[model samples]
Target: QTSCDQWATFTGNGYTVSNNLWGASAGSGFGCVTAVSLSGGASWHADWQWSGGQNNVKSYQNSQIAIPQKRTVNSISSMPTTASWSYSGSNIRANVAYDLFTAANPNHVTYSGDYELMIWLGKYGDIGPIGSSQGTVNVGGQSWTLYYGYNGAMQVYSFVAQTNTTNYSGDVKNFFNYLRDNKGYNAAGQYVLSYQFGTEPFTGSGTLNVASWTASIN
Candidate 1:
């Protein structure tokens, strides 16, 4: 089933999809998500439009799943992911990205000191990432302009693609390893909590069609 409710949610096959209108009041529009399980993995898409919000994000319609077992960054061997997607609309300023988290402890529900990592596959309109551009880096065979900043006390690391990527496939673990090796990130200490894939609308409207998304962490 699909819904336009503020916090509509669907859970099945170890994955959950949400129509998270976290900052709905910041704008005036609606975001919708549908959840289903495929033979390979979870399948879903987000359709939304926000016209009144000036800068604040209206919503993040996404599909999220917890890691099979709580694992530290260092213990992970590979996190492979594949996505085939397309979108249609106009005057849109939103980003299609993968949002992941790492916490100081094993708790998956609460994240204060945790790190928020985002990998943007597609960026449209004039939207940009938070923080200043740190420089460009090659992660998972793609060139991304990295950005760093602090949202309150939590660290925000965003890897934005140089170009829009409608289709993606690679080892997502490469992103974590890049941080650990280059930035002295403590892989052994941070516990992998979970990950969500969705679009964050800075402003504008559109429908993001995710044909298929398959991911694994070990």
Candidate 2:
């Protein structure tokens, strides 16, 4: 745990700003942005607030244990996603948007267009070997349904952004071609998941880099 009790001021030409007070935690795990006070004759106080729960808890005393507070001070032009990106740990997953053509090593026969989409996880790899056949596996000891779509669609239900490292990658081009030949893109392209936030919703504070997206795919 950590605390601050000093006024840090920024004095310059035409622009002068100051932060009267701030507080945060310095632990190994994730922390919260607790409190901040900006004073330059006019004072503003922002006590930490919980955004996860359905009901907003304004008072700091009612906060969840271990979740520390983080605070920041910056001119509007200097605002970056770091503050939000800090929230990206092992548990937070993403519904990412990526093109399989860009991720593959350059080889004409091995490549195509935006031929694949995935429901990927972060940090860890798949449970078993990477093969064409499909099978079920247990994650955190729970049975999770798995399938591979060859140019088709794999409707994934739930995923922890930071925790999942496993995925089902295959020749999805065939599935898409099949869909186009029979089902059409709109009908067969529809994929589903159990309990996901949305399709490619922003989660944390990083630039959306879909280059070699081994993690989540929108």
Candidate 3:
């Protein structure tokens, strides 16, 4: 378990778990993200809690695994992932998701002119993605409401689950595939910078327990 008001990062098994409290200055509150367990290079778990900042997201506590060097959408075979979790507490406003980023310049230190792909497993309270709903589509054997918008120099594509999915197992690449095939997302030449999974909290008090999570790129 660990806590920090700034960036607290833990690394293991080729992955990096971060308590990125970049928005902590937006509100007054107490928050912490704890690494519960990590087994082998395939599975892990974490716990998190946060309060305050009703109007803006206070933090994104996530575990990130880097893609192989020079990996583009066409060169990758598959990305399978599984996540099991449970939540408790009150007045919670948040979403559990996988945040993937792609960029044209692999050497870019930050997400400039990047594409942000988000697959939302669950949503609570009045939380929402960056854009308006486009339509519904099925991917990874699940239905999702897609939303699109831009955040600064990045284009945001969000697939929100039709129903809350507490325990999920699916191909993470399917989300990207759908975008490329139908949404004009030209990922063929872009480098996949990183793949991340975690919760984005906007307000209230709550505990999110990630029982197990696994992700791999083939």
Candidate 4:
């Protein structure tokens, strides 16, 4: 003989969404969406933070198992959404093309060092120029807030890791040419636009890593 029990479990603490920000009420303090984890082995999602004149908003998820404390979320800088847009019910998808910006630090300022790449998911589908958006972005590990951009004008996109240098020299140099043709590099001696390029990932630098190359989206 066997028995089955049906049950309902809440994925996270109930909260309210307002002004495009997610937060708790009354007794609940400020909370933000940080990451999302799925049932199967999957990639985690990352969330971005937002602040206004009077209020600040955050998003977060609870662990499958109870714990003494909640996991603190690290807020990344805001990134712009793709020019083109589409949607399915409450979900949104967009086609985006970003020129490689120079290396940046946790402060979101340009600096020279190793950096990891973080791109908006759900809309475009795949990580590269290829298609991948039909699938749902993992909500528990990263969450939808971080994966999506602002509702209005776009802004600088931020990532969790430093920009990959080995895979960007060529693209960077080409961007330098684009700057020269247009006007010139900035006072910081850096080009305004950069693309992903390197011999390491695609060629034979012995590193199995790969990066993206961008072209005009028209």
Instruction: Give the winner by lDDT.
Output: 1
Consecutive 10-residue window with the lowest summed lDDT within model 3: 40-49
RMSD to the hidden true structure, all candidates: 1.5, 18.8, 2.0, 18.4
Report the lDDT of model 4 for residue 100.
Answer: 38
lDDT of each: 0.82, 0.23, 0.78, 0.22
Model 3: per-residue Cα lDDT at residue 181: 91
Q: Which ten residues in a row have the lowest lDDT in candidate 2?
A: 75-84
Cα lDDT tens digits for candidate 3, 82-192:
888877878778888988888878765433347888999989999889878999999988899999998876899999998889989998778888988998888787777
Give the candidates in order of lDDT, highest first: 1, 3, 2, 4
Give candidate 2's error at residue 184 in angstroms.
Answer: 2.8
- What digit string (tens of lDDT, one per residue) describes model 1 on residues 143-170? 9999998887778889999988988998
Q: Return the clash pairs for model 1, or none.
A: none
Q: Highest TM-score: give the candidate number.
A: 1
Candidate 2 lDDT over 36-143, as tens digits, reads 221211111111211232221111111011102211111111211000111132322223211222111222221132233232333221322112334443433333
The CA lDDT at 184 in model 3 is: 80
Poorly placed runs, candidate 4 (over 4 Å): 1-93, 102-108, 111-172, 186-188, 191-218
